């Protein structure tokens, strides 16, 4: 299993749905027996520049150990979901189960 690290920024209007989306993605990964090493909802953060004329996205970070097929499926879900403004998934060698600097 490959360690991934996902950050997906959500439209602030849809901030009330973020725990639901978090639960759905967690359930998918857990159903695929993927580990979840970190999950940190950063909240609204006042983006440096207006993405699609919108500010203050809901960042939400999540470090995961899961297979690549489920990651690809999750990426497709991100692309098709209008709620999430942006997302990025990056491979990592080791699961960094430590506190994030901004949360710290």
């Amino acid at each position: 299993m490959r360690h991934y690290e996902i950050v997906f920024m959500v439209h602030p209007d849809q901030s009330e749905q973020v725990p639901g989306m978090i639960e759905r993605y967690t359930a998918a990964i857990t159903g695929a027996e993927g580990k979840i090493h970190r999950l940190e909802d950063w909240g609204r953060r006042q983006l440096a520049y207006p993405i699609n004329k919108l500010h203050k996205a809901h960042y939400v970070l999540m470090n995961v150990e899961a297979p690549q097929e489920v990651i690809d499926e999750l990426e497709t879900t991100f692309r098709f979901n209008d709620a999430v403004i942006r997302s990025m998934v990056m491979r990592t060698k080791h699961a960094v189960t430590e506190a994030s600097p901004m949360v710290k």
């Binding site: 520049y49 207006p50 993405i51 942006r86 990056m90």
Partner: protein, 67 residues
Amino acid sequence: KFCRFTAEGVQEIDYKDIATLKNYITESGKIVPSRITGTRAKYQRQLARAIKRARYLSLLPYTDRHQ
């Protein structure tokens, strides 16, 4: 001189650490050269990747004439 990263034995830049990236960018938003900063070459490349990833995630501005 005085490469800051090798002083603490940092393994990776961890782009989420904005404050360090703020030190290593200029007011206009571009990356300060390693010749000026004093960073080692390997950490400089890691720092450049981290800043670019942060710019994509909109934690840092590409330029000051953006928003």
